[PDB]
Amino acid sequence: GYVPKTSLSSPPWPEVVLPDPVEETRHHAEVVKKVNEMIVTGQYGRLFAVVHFASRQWKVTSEDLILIGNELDLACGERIRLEKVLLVGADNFTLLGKPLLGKDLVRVEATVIEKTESWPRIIMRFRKRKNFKKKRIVTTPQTVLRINSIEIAPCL
């Protein structure tokens, strides 16, 4: 079933081929060992983690602020340990789970600064000739967080 080379004999995209599984696993293990050695040597600098807190994925780095639109019932001035991280890295290397990462692999330290409220939000509804005029003011609660640092271990 030979097909002479023509404008439509073969697909336009390049027909690439993947390597063997043995060599692929070998290279994977080699790169994993290299990354473990680099982490043990302390070459990383200023780590960053994507913390999925309050149903929102924040691109956290270090010394950054976060404001949540709800209450957590925590006294201002207490250390908190966040989890559900799935994208840790820095330079020349990255780390991500499937989806979340191991607890012993990442450690996000955060604290509470204040627990304020949102600015006076105005609610209003109107219609045409229906005498519909509804008004209401809402002031949802708010909080503030500060990630002290993001530690990492050579657990691999």
Binding site: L18, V50, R56
Partner: protein, 70 residues
């Protein structure tokens, strides 16, 4: 060197759930992270194509094979 639909599909086909805000933030302030993500997406796309073509037997994609839970 990729498209948004195929990229999103490949990212979803790897248990790496990431919203669009974080993706844009990384692409803006982390070009290497987005490059690695695009490389992983292209690898997943190629693996899925090879599987659909040969029905595996028995590689099942080194990057595929989702982690089961219970």
């Amino acid at each position: 060197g990729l498209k948004y639909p195929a990229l999103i599909g490949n990212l979803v086909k790897c248990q790496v759930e990431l919203n669009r805000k974080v993706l844009a933030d990384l692409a803006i302030y982390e070009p290497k992270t987005f490059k690695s993500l695009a490389a992983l997406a292209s690898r997943r796309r190629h693996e899925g194509f090879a599987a659909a073509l040969g029905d595996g037997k028995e590689p099942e994609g080194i990057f595929s094979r989702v982690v089961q839970y219970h």
